[PDB]
Structure 1
Amino acid sequence: HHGGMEKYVAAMVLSAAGDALGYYNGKWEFLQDGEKIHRQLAQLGGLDALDVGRWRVSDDTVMHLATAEALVEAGKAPKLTQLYYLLAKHYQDCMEDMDGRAPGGASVHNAMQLKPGKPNGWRIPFNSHEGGCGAAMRAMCIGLRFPHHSQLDTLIQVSIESGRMTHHHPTGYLGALASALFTAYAVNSRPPLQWGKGLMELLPEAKKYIVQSGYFVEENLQHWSYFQTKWENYLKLRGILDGESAPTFPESFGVKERDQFYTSLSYSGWGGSSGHDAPMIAYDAVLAAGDSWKELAHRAFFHGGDSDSTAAIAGCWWGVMYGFKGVSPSNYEKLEYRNRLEETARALYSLGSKEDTVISL
């Protein structure tokens, strides 16, 4: 109602529901173990009993809305110069809404360094500690804005530059690429088993952009292999490297096995905390879950890692594909910023549903 638009609304609202559920007002951090989280989940009456009335969204939704609101304000056929001004401004400004929302170090530090308005004032230098998932968690709606094939170059550039406004490390900003790219694939009903291959094919194009852009190319290139290698390895493991083949999951892949797997994906032991593994876990959830919100939630919202970020990503992708089908109303009806999220979604659809261009840098 319209069917196109319904998917956009769900992408935005269920991304935020995911964040809130995966955050639980920071309480999951005192457990930091999927089995312990799943048992506390049971004692709250399970997923369908959860009322998000008092479950605040975290930094993930706040920053996702900032992306979305910037895209919307940029309008039809924007100067990429204006879009980057607006993304910087929205990111910097949204830092005022992080009370009790546990934002990340790179997100905060860098958003506060930006100089929106000044030519190139939204660029920061390369940094070794900037491979967190703070760019990936907020980039999905770039794929809603720019879903058409003709726009791939835009999606690549915008996802990367939105990302490296806070995360100028390929592990960071390629997270944003994957987040946006897969949202675009979901918009276009591209079956999820093809998404990984798609990303592996676009990484050389992302590299060509980073190279022509001319910023810290030496450093960017030298760290480039970590992301790529982790994704190759993961798609190999799941048997979807060829992108024609349905995924293979282990016989034994319950809550406990998922935690250990998420830890093996991680940079330094914390599943989904980085730009490579946050979208990877969301992707793994989406591939297992099909049309089940409960399944997606048990895999992407409730685990011992950065479940808020994995949930934000997975909930967006999943909502694009499946709308609100099978979702308990208590899980989103009183979700913080629901009206705001619906309104931005509608506005993103207006733009996204029209195959326009950008005025280049």
Structure 2
Amino acid sequence: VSLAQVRGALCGALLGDCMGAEFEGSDAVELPDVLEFVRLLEKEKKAGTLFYTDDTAMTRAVIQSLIAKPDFDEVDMAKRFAEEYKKEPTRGYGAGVVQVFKKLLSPKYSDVFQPAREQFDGKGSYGNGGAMRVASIALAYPNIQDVIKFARRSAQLTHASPLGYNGAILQALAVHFALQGELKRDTFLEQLIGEMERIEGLPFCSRLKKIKEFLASSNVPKADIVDELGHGIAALESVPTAIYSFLHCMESDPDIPDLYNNLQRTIIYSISLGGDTDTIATMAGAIAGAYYGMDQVTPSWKRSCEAIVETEESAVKLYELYCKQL
């Protein structure tokens, strides 16, 4: 695993969040809007015109916890989540998860997992908020067993439903396997299916099997992807879609100009799917970034993003943590 890959993953996550943010929840977004957006963005004279959202706010909190406590400290991490919320509450947090932060900030809970368990009448959140921030677990911990147990724990601080935390594990594993050289598309899916069959044993495996079917077809319409995989706030309806976006964009897409590289193509395609665009693109962007590396994060794109320099600095620190774990 190279510095290029860790850098790529975090910068890809940042780009996906920043670029996807203006379209999130849009019923009307289609590819022409996204292509226009990109060509305008590339000519913007001022840097830093795209602000990040909760997806990145929580990512940065995860990273600062991993650097402060590299053996993984869920109490430290919970505190950083709640304090980040308190400091910048308008970044775009889910309507449910705010109550978790409020309870963590209160004196009443000793068990930092207990607020999450109380969400949605004790069923817990099945939102994608655990998955949107989880990439860095795969960037800090080379051992897959660590990736799984820490992805799960980091997610369970807000997402107590298995759909929520298994979605976070799935996203962490997709980044993990993308880091392993440049696996062939079919090997990558086989790796993910193998792991999720064990973990769920099966909603996420079902979606991964559909993905295998889609990848074996040609010219699959957006509507079929949306209808079968989803583009929603639920982890089940967003994490597989992000994985699909990444795997699809390993090859040319006839509607996206081939002057865009694979990572750019992945982000554009993700956003073009509509729905939860900042989170699907932040997840697909983390996976693509880990896979292709920083070579595909172009200067005109990355300069557009709030906190790019801090993000690059944090990628160097995560890389050193990863190397130390070896």
2:148 to 156, 163, 172: 156
Q: Which runs of 5+ in 1 are unaligned?
A: 208-223, 239-246, 357-361
Percent identity over paired residues = 22
Pair 96,182 (structure 1): closer, same or farther in 2 beyond 3 Å: same
Equivalent residue number for residue 310 of structure 1? 280
Pair 97,40 (structure 1): closer, same or farther in 2 beyond 3 Å: farther
Q: How does 1:196-235 map to 2 (within 5 A)?
A: 196-203=189-196, 205-206=198-199, 225-232=202-209, 234-235=210-211
| RMSD, matched Cα | 2.7
For 1:353, what is the secondary structure of its paired residue? helix
Equivalent residue number for residue 262 of structure 1? 226
Equivalent residue number for residue 210 of structure 1? none
Q: How does 1:1-361 map to 2 (within 5 A)?
A: 4-24=2-22, 27-29=23-25, 31-35=26-30, 38-44=31-37, 46=39, 49=42, 51=44, 53-75=48-70, 78=71, 80=72, 83-114=73-104, 120-123=111-114, 124-125=116-117, 127-128=122-123, 130-147=125-142, 151-189=143-181, 191=183, 192-203=185-196, 205-206=198-199, 225-232=202-209, 234-238=210-214, 247-251=215-219, 253=220, 257-266=221-230, 271-290=231-250, 292-355=262-325
| Separation in 2, partners of 1:282, 1:332 | 20
For 2:272, what is the secondary structure of its paired residue? coil
| Separation in 2, partners of 1:163, 1:139 | 8
Pair 183,98 (structure 1): closer, same or farther in 2 beyond 3 Å: same
Paired residues, what number? Answer: 308
Q: Which amino acid aligns with 1:171?
A: L
TM-score, with normalisation over the residues of structure 2? 0.84
Does the aligned pair in 2 maintain the 1:48–1:328 contact within 8 Å?
no
- CA offsets per residue over residues 104-156 of structure 1, 9 Å max, x none? 13332223323799764334326446111111101011001112xxx222211
TM-score, with normalisation over the residues of structure 1? 0.76
Q: Which runs of 5+ in 2 are unaligned?
A: 251-260
| Separation in 2, partners of 1:225, 1:116 | 37
> Per chain length, whose mean CA-contact separation is higher, i.e. which structure has more relative contact order (CA < 8 Å, sep 6+)?
2
Does the aligned pair in 2 maintain the 1:163–1:176 contact within 8 Å?
yes
Does the aligned pair in 1 maintain the 2:41–2:304 contact within 8 Å?
no
Equivalent residue number for residue 257 of structure 2? none
- CA offsets per residue over residues 272-295 of structure 1, 9 Å max, x none? 422123221111111121251332
- CA offsets per residue over residues 188-227 of structure 1, 9 Å max, x none? 22514323332332235535xxxxxxxxxxxxxxxx8333
Does the aligned pair in 2 maintain the 1:231–1:276 contact within 8 Å?
no
